[PDB]
A paper describes a structure:
The bacterial injectisome, or type III secretion system ([name]), is a specialized syringe-shaped protein-export system utilized by many pathogenic Gram-negative bacteria for the injection of virulence proteins (effectors) into host cells. The injectisome can be divided into three major regions: the inner- (IM) and outer-membrane (OM) spanning basal body with associated export apparatus and ATPase components, an extracellular needle, and a terminating pore inserted into the host cell membrane called the translocon. The major structural scaffold of the basal body is comprised largely of three proteins that arrange into a series of highly oligomerized, concentric rings: two intimately associated proteins localized to the IM - PrgK/EscJ/MxiJ and [name]/EscD/MxiG, and a third protein belonging to the secretin family of OM proteins, InvG/EscC/MxiD ([name] serovar Typhimurium [name]-1, Enteropathogenic Escherichia coli (EPEC) LEE and Shigella dysenteriae nomenclature, respectively). In summary, we report the crystal structures for the cytoplasmic and periplasmic domains of [name] and InvG, two of the main basal body components of the prototypical Salmonella [name]-1 injectisome.
A ∼20° subunit rotation in the hexamer of the crystal structure accommodates the tighter packing but superposition of the interface secondary structural units shows significant conservation with both interfaces having similar buried surface areas (640 Å2 vs. 546 Å2 for hexamer and 24mer respectively). Collectively, the crystallographic packing interfaces we observe support and mirror the low energy interfaces generated in our modelled basal body. This would be consistent with a model whereby the soluble domains have low-affinity interaction surfaces for oligomerization, which can be captured by the high concentration in the crystallization experiment. FHA domains are frequently involved in interaction with phosphothreonine (pThr)-modified proteins. In Shigella, the [name] orthologue MxiG was reported to interact with phosphorylated peptides from the secretion apparatus protein Spa33 although a separate study failed to corroborate these results, and structures of the Yersinia orthologue YscD revealed an unconserved phosphothreonine binding motif. Protein sequence alignment of the [name] orthologues indeed illustrates that the conserved residues involved in phosphopeptide binding in FHA domains are poorly conserved. To validate this, we engineered mutations of the [name] residues corresponding to the proposed phosphothreonine interacting residues in MxiG - Arg35, Gln42 and Asp65 - to alanine. These mutations have no effect on in vivo secretion assays. We therefore conclude that the [name] cytoplasmic domain is unlikely to interact with pThr-modified proteins. We note however that the FHA phosphopeptide interacting loops in our [name] structure are accessible on the cytoplasmic face of the ring model, suggesting a potential interface for protein-protein interactions.
Residue numbers in the entry:
A (entry chain E), B (entry chain D), C (entry chain C), D (entry chain B), E (entry chain A), F (entry chain F): 14 to 119
The structure:
């Protein structure tokens, strides 16, 4: 399985496990956080990341096979889907992340 | 069953599952959120969505069959009903949502 | 069992179940909400409803028989009681509510 | 047993059970509330209330017999005690309370 | 066993049970409270007390025998200890507390 | 088993267990705290420590053997690693910490 690590933001170093399928990252200010509590405590498929400026929500999708990883950047009324590589910094809005095999520490 | 997906707001991407019968969405600023905690932690039939402008509460009704979905936009002392289709954006106040089957991600 | 539905306020559409005996609704601004957390998480007999203007605290009494429903507005150092009809809008200060049987959606 | 009812404030109508022995009421602004969560969820013996001005904490002691009720107002490094009666408004700081038998609503 | 009673602060009159061994009191503003939730819900060996100014964290140590009581005031990278007597106001920073036997009400 | 004790900050005195493997400490202001709630309630591998100035996120890795302890400071786009000792004050940015065997109180 794969892990998303933050390489910047006040949560730099935080590591989030990804489930097979879709994981949502909500990225933004106060208004989003306190409301994100709306989602149940089910095995976490959405996470909130605080960022004061330039935050863009995104999903990561890990195919059932774990052979392709797709990042869906969620813009106004549309999304931009990109193929992404492991163990490399990936910029999403003003956030910088890395996706690593669980067994390969960064 | 069906899932309500936000297509704008700070929570763009967030997905809320619908139960048979009735689910309420409270859409608005700070005053509503902190108070929405008043409702018990029972299987979630009301959700809060932050929106800084143009938020209008609405409830979705799904029949026992799960073949018809009606949205009721809640105005002052009254409501306005509309039939909805799956997989199509729906504008309620300034919020844009889409209703999808669980099995067809969007 | 009866349900109180809000017909206005930022919480328009919210529905609160009524227990036999007494249910209190505290209606007002920010100061009341954050402090209403003082009351335990026991089966809910008190609710907070935000209203920027004209909010009047009230309690509702359901007799053991469920044949009469009494509403008390909690004014300064006094209260004003009245019988209320089911399935009809009821104004309390500037809040508008409706009490319905759990079996009759509005 | 007995019930403490608030007869004024934004929280007019709130009812709290008095326990056998000693019950403490913490009265004041935001700073006290969020911190009152420090106390465990044991059968409630301290309770918080909000009051914008003149909030004085107080404790009520009830004898084994339930015939005497002593209220202690908690001032700086000292307390001022008085015997109180049932079903009679009692002023404590800016707050007006009333202590009633459970079986006798106000 | 022994109880810590607050003799000032917004929580004046609050009484915290002490366990044999070391109990931590974190005393300060908002930043500490919300983060104190980090500590597990194990039998409470930690308490948060709100104080807007002059708050100092401290530990109370009750030897296994319950014959000596030591307060450790926490400073930068070090602590300063003193023996404390029962039933007398103890100043820690701007907080005022009193340690009593459970059987001797203050 | 090893324990991290804070020797400064508003949480001076708080202690955090270290798990075998990796533990992250997020050290900063308000924005990080409220959002750190994003991480699940799984056996705690990240913790948040408030510090108004000079906070540096850092992670500690305890080898499977429990014979070496390595602390990594998480700077901008990079990390800095060093061996650290038990039972001695360790400066990490402006935080002061100490790591002890659980069996040896401090
Ligand atoms: Ca007596």
């Amino acid at each position: 399985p794969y892990i998303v690590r933050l390489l910047n933001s006040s949560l730099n170093g935080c590591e989030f496990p990804l489930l097979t399928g879709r994981t949502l990252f909500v990225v933004g200010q106060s208004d989003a956080l306190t409301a994100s509590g709306q989602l149940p405590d089910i095995p976490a498929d959405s996470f909130f990341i605080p960022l004061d400026h330039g935050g863009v929500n995104f999903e990561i999708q890990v195919d059932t096979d774990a052979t392709e990883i797709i990042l869906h950047e969620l813009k106004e009324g549309n999304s931009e889907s990109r193929s992404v590589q492991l163990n490399t910094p990936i910029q999403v809005g003003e956030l910088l992340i890395l996706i690593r095999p669980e067994s390969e520490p960064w």
